[PDB]
Amino acid sequence: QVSPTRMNLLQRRGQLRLAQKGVDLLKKKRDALVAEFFGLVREAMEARKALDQAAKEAYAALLLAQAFDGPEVVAGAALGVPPLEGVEAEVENVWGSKVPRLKATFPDGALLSPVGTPAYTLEASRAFRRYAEALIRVANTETRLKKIGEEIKKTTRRVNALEQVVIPGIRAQIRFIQQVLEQREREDTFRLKRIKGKIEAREAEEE
Amino acid sequence: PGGDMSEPVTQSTLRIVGAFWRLDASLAFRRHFPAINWNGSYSLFTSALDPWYRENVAEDYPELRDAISELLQREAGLQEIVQLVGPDALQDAERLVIEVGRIIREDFLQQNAYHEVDAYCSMKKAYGIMKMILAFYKEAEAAIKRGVSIDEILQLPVLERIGRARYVSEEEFPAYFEEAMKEIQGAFKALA
Amino acid sequence: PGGDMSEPVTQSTLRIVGAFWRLDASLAFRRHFPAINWNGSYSLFTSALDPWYRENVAEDYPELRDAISELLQREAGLQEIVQLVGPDALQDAERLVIEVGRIIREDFLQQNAYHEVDAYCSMKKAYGIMKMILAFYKEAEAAIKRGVSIDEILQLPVLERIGRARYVSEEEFPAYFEEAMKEIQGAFKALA
Amino acid sequence: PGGDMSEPVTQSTLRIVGAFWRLDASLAFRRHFPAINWNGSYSLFTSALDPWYRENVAEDYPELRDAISELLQREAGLQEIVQLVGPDALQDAERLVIEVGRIIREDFLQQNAYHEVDAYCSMKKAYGIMKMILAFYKEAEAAIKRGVSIDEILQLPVLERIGRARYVSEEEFPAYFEEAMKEIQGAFKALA
Amino acid sequence: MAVIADPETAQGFRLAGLEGYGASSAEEAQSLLETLVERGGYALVAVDEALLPDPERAVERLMRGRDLPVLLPIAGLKEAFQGHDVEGYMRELVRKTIGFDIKL
Amino acid sequence: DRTHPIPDLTGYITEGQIQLSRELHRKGIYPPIDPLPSLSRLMNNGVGKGKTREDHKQVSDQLYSAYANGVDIRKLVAIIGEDALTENDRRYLQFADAFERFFINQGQQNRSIEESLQIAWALLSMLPQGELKRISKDHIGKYYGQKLEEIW
Amino acid sequence: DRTHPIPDLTGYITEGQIQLSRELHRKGIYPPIDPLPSLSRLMNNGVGKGKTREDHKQVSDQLYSAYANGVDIRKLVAIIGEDALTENDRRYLQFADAFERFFINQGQQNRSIEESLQIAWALLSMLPQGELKRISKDHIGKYYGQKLEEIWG
Amino acid sequence: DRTHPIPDLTGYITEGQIQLSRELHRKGIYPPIDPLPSLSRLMNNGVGKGKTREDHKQVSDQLYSAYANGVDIRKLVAIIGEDALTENDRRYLQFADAFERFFINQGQQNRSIEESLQIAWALLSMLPQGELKRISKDHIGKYYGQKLEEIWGAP
């Protein structure tokens, strides 16, 4: 509950002013987040377009590769290559929130038989290497994009919730306290009129 | 009467007095004594006591006092944002301002009047405490602009020296003050 | 007059009475009658009526009541962070507390007084509905950790048998109650 | 004195008057003279002044009055998307709505009181500009229904005639309205 | 890394030094995505588009924390003749991501 | 507000209330009467078999429960994302929209009680027979299905 | 409320109050005493070394500091959610309900000053040194280090 | 509070007000006048050509808008960061920082209207041309471009 005084009324007015400043502060934060979201989304569509280009080229290289060369021997060359472990993800502490950016190791000097008796597994290897690079770039673009988007909707629901909940609640508390202070003032000016009548009665009894 | 400073006695002495010292209950519920509301207190004598301070305390005393007062103002300015958003999602300088405001409110302003030492405090001692807190703040601010992490400055061991600095006697207070100041500069130099 | 329980007549009658049955206006606009605020009303005869309960309604009747009351308190504390985040970020039991709390406030704590048979309720029928609700919660929380979705436990045909249990007569109710206990104990054995 | 409309005086006045014309200082800061806010103003004499409009102005006058009120409703209805993004990323028809609401504001509602012939505007001249704006809107809407891009609609030389529609003497407005209404149909049948 | 794209495409992935699988059957590939989240293949998973339109389903069911399998709605070689609306995919990204259906 | 002396001393005397809502009037809906904060404290006498048509109390209670659920989950989904919802959720949203657009917004006409009850059944046929928990099966058998684009 | 003329003037004459809270009574705690608004004025004449035990006033001050941190961090939890807390903030949030369910909440049981001081120390052991900046070093050297599983069972 | 009867009736009789801020005084600034809640209702009559100078009203309006949107950027940078703003936002932030310690923080120096407008144009010279929207191009062509460390009105 709330104690009806004059000091509590000025406290509720003060935090009403604080909430009305916080609405502006959060809307400016959202107006920055929207601009950075629109900055990221064109880079996302550019990364996805380069992904489409590398997909078409690596698929053409793989189909011509295991079409002219045997599928069995390119499968054996796939089963001879190690899994190239060590791909990982580290901190991007954007808006006080770690999102994982990813990159791989991909050793280039130690290729298994660079004079490869299949003459198409080297080209398919470079093609799918560029394909995996396009995947990891689109990956750590779009996880950033999804984080910025959920931050925008979190800020927007906080703005709308703070307005539609604790602006009229504080206004109702202020109006309640003002009405009961007017009540006490009206009681005081009733008592003063009564005591002025009782002062006047002394002279009419003095007679 | 009601706890409210909006009364015919309070707002009459509030006009006819200088040096008003408002006690709030929220700083007295938690046992943080003296419960001086910093935001609702004033003194109209800070411009008449200036030459006495420059002669009988130190020469740079009122600039140090005004810097303490503007750090408390910056803390009270950031209180809106930190109570709305939270203690995180601040930057590192603003978080350093809030933690230095905490260390001021807990190690310079707070004073229990029952301990043997620290019931009385000469202003040489208060000048030493404010000089230590400002040396910590300015060197931590310079160290955090070039880039060190926040919350490794909050874990430094010289905070124990600044915290217990209000409990040491006034006899050995220069022999504590020189060691604590050199420990501030040495801990920030070995910090990187 | 205005809701507003700080009235002179209300605070004058509030010091002397032994049971306070507060009605709401936010809870009678959903047509949830009777509109007794179960979080804010109180009694003082609960400690004195316990031997009568133990000799005339059940033996574990006060503990079953206290379990119902702490489910209502838990749902009341949980509903505010539900209104914060929605029904998504609730973990798994945070949602089952809400569903059992809604079965409570739409089966046990709701009574028509215009229906022919849901106007009177002896202590046995309220105790039977309480055993059905707490049996459902006790045997569903133990079944939610053997790998059952929360979006499976709600669509059982026995939840309707709980929900319409307040519409049966005083004579039909024990034969309804033991069969409903068989259905609650048997609709979780086939659960997976 | 407060600037809020919930004193007893303003409430009693709004109870006993028949129209209210909310001047707002934001529009005169934005240099929109006169500064009548239309989202907060009201007038109850619209339904009773119907046959005078039907006789002395035109038989369809309340319908396009409601149409311009409908456009000014929908612009401020979708103002939030414009404030969150900007007018260049609205779809097609919503950008047509904001631009025709803009031409309503910057031509029809706004009025220079210190001008020679824009100081006064009778019912026939207001009806002329009214029909001109509404005909341009619901013909450019059909031009978008063809599939014409938004860019060629905006930069177009007939909008200068709707711009200087109000800087025309009422001696010469029945020599201007017909030619501008022919130009609108011509420049929207000349397009693809 | 790991994919579940196609039984033919994963051979070039293994040729690149990268784990890949293939089912070409939607519910079975959702089961494979469940067991592949459980045997987490270096925190990056690419799932075929016309096998699962949304890859998010298995992770939003099981692992509501930390987003360890980074899920990518990858394409396939059957639609490498047309690309199937890159910018329409970006429009559904914008609409799914901020709620607002906008174009330019 | 209802906490002013005139409405609360009136509500203490009378036999119900009907509350004009400002939020319905802002959408141009006439006559704006939201049926959530309003009730007739009577009317369990003046409805039923032989006074009005025999389905009246059940129809009114089902309309109130369905529109209360519709406006409640409207206020729910109005802050969370518009996805992550089932199908009868969307049926309740469309029921609330068509309710406040056809049943409430009558626009100054003398609807009969049979006309308004067939408008009510036309809106109730926007929901499955299972979701009408408060209407008995005889009234489901007689009624439940029209075209609300026909009767208007 | 404390604002009304009867308890206000009462608290201006008298020296201390023991204020009950309805917020703790609905949780099921007896005796429902929230320690923040309640204060014994001349406690310092009856406590200390040679009267009860030498640690008593500093233990009281540290209990008040840590429980006030728990109380005003509950509001921060309420406005940012649970999972966004640093460590030592969850430790204050666990100190708060351990305090309310073990130190305040008793039955009709009569506990002397040693059981009450060891339960206060067992709750203070939930916080490490360096947060206990109101207790001196000899007291925290010779009393720290007891859990709740040793003050009863 | 401006709802007390004494300032309420005084502002209901007088022509505007100038309002001391407690925030600038504790920050340490004399005279502590924030110009955002202050107002001279009868200002625009007593300035212009023949009264002070032709740019007085436009300098006043531009300083009011620039400080009024510098303060909220200062409030915004607590939660976003200095590097994550645009160029113009950092320019308004530096404008507000220089404004409230060279224009308001006067001390007891006596400034005529020419030195005061000289400091005002030295403060407006921080913001780039074209962002000074509320000033005519003649006055910008006459007065834009002036150092603060050359005028020594407030060095």
Side-chain angles (χ1 to χ4, degrees), chain B residues 37-79:
Chain B
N37 191 2
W38 183 79
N39 200 2
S41 299
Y42 65 90
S43 178
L44 299 173
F45 296 103
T46 61
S47 66
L49 301 173
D50 190 354
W52 192 82
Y53 286 157
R54 295 185 186 275
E55 187 174 0
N56 293 116
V57 180
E59 185 68 29
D60 55 354
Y61 176 80
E63 289 86 4
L64 191 66
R65 177 183 64 188
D66 290 332
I68 283 290
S69 296
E70 70 184 4
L71 263 67
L72 291 177
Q73 177 59 49
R74 290 181 64 189
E75 184 187 7
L78 294 174
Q79 282 298 321

Side-chain angles (χ1 to χ4, degrees), chain A residues 177-189:
Chain A
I177 295 167
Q178 288 177 357
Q179 289 168 359
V180 68
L181 288 175
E182 290 173 352
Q183 175 66 256
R184 294 176 184 173
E185 181 180 0
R186 194 174 298 116
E187 293 178 356
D188 290 336
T189 188

